[PDB]
């Protein structure tokens, strides 16, 4: 794998969250990329995930209201946020700009699968969780 980590995300969260998080991860020594894994409306998410896991040791998902309403199989995120392929692992999903009603409406089984939350956890705390596993 050429990369340590890829970050699946919606376009609404790319510049104001994924980019600072990626830069923080790079400062900690993690080789991370994300530009090719932006989810737009009508995209196949699993297509992006298969590409990410093919060339990255790990992946994570930025679970926003925008992301979960764009995900055609949002109700199956509870399986996807822990998906593995070729020994590469989706890990540490991140709650980010999402409401509990959004989880109840579009992916109820996801609720106890996620712990990180950018409304309670800082970007630096989240980056350290990823960095400690990767390095």
Question: Phi, psi (5° rounding) for residue 91?
Answer: -140, 160
User: Domain coordinates of the chain in residue numbers?
Assistant: 1-135
Experimental approach taken: X-ray
Distance CA 82, CA 98 (A): 19
Residues taking part in catalysis: 76
Residue of 129, 131, 113 whose CA lies nearest to 121: 129
The answer to whether the CB of 77 falls within 8 A of the CB of 68 is: yes
CA dihedral 60, 63, 64, 67 (to 10 degrees): 80
The answer to whether the CB of 133 falls within 8 A of the CB of 116 is: no
């Amino acid at each position: 794998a050429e990369y340590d980590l890829f970050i699946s995300h919606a376009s609404e969260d790319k510049e104001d969250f994924v980019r600072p998080l990626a830069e923080t991860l790079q400062q900690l020594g993690v080789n991370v990329w994300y530009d090719e894994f932006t989810l737009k409306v009508g995209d196949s998410l699993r297509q992006k995930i298969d590409s990410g896991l093919r060339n990255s040791k790990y992946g994570t998902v930025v679970l926003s209201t925008d992301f979960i309403k764009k995900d055609w199989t949002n109700y199956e995120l509870d399986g996807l946020v822990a998906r593995e392929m070729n020994g590469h692992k989706m890990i540490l999903p991140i709650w980010h700009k999402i409401t509990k009603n959004d989880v109840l409406d579009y992916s109820p089984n996801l609720a106890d699968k996620v712990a990180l939350n950018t409304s309670v956890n800082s970007i630096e705390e989240i980056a350290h969780q990823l960095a400690d596993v990767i390095l």
